[PDB]
Amino acid sequence: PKISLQIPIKLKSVLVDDWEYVTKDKKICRLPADVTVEMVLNKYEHEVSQELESPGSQSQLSEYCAGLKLYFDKCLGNMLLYRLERLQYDELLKKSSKDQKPLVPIRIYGAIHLLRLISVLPELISSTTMDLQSCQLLIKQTEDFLVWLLMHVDEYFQYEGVALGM
């Protein structure tokens, strides 16, 4: 039993370059990112909704993009950070407390952390109670987003970070 999510090899390779830059070279992303998660998903929804005929097709894409923003805000600080990136996060969290303004991750982090989210989506789905057809739509919408991300791969893109038993 595997939740099958096809991630193009080029994008898997992007995730491994990122893993090397953080966990081997010890280089964190500059924050805020120039193109936040929110801007990536705004552009995607904005383009792809122009090539959909059905009205139900447009709602499901908007509910996908909105749900993916919502889930990135929940996951980021819980499961999308390398250990090395926690200081950066704990500092952002500290600025949020002092400036009395809540931390919204989709407005700080960028495309690579969104792709980290996608890479762990199959494992999250696997333990969840949901209708099979709801899972198949979730897989379809994500693979559509992925080949759009690959289409724009040049526009957007002591030991830790490997789970040997996974």
Partner: protein, 35 residues
């Protein structure tokens, strides 16, 4: 067919440091070492 927005509060979030799974990325991780 429920969308991700309606499934948001049912898909549990892990608390863990982020990792890449070996079965899907191991061949790329080993090639990455040889650069």
């Amino acid at each position: 067919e429920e969308t991700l927005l309606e499934l948001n509060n049912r898909i549990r979030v892990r608390k863990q440091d982020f990792t890449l799974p070996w079965e899907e990325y191991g061949e790329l991780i080993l090639e990455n070492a040889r650069k």
